[PDB]
């Protein structure tokens, strides 16, 4: 049976949501001199990309396009960083940019969890993906909260 419109939209939106994690990590790898922050940024890039590859494959199998872009207001509700917030990671003094990176990525991951919980009650591969997203996001949030506390 084909993926439902809700399942298709969920994957389309999550693929774009995950992509932003890469935009947030890039300035840390460019600017931070903290091995702690750099290590964490790399790890999040790798975990988000693994899930993006799964989402891309799903959309390909379903013969569904990528979503239309998310609107700024709706991106904000999803916990995504605004245009300005992402730019701050490149323009703010580095120590402030590191803290902002963690705050933005935490809020980002909280939005991902909140988008995903309703999908736990779905087509098996979507349920599996949803569970993986929630587990991974929650692990990374806990690490980021620890790092933010130690900075
Ligand atoms: Cl990749």
From TrEMBL:
Residues 7-147 form the DUF305 domain. Coiled coil: none annotated. This is DUF305 domain-containing protein. It comes from Deinococcus radiodurans (strain ATCC 13939 / DSM 20539 / JCM 16871 / CCUG 27074 / LMG 4051 / NBRC 15346 / NCIMB 9279 / VKM B-1422 / R1). The chain holds residues 27 to 179 of 197 of the full protein.
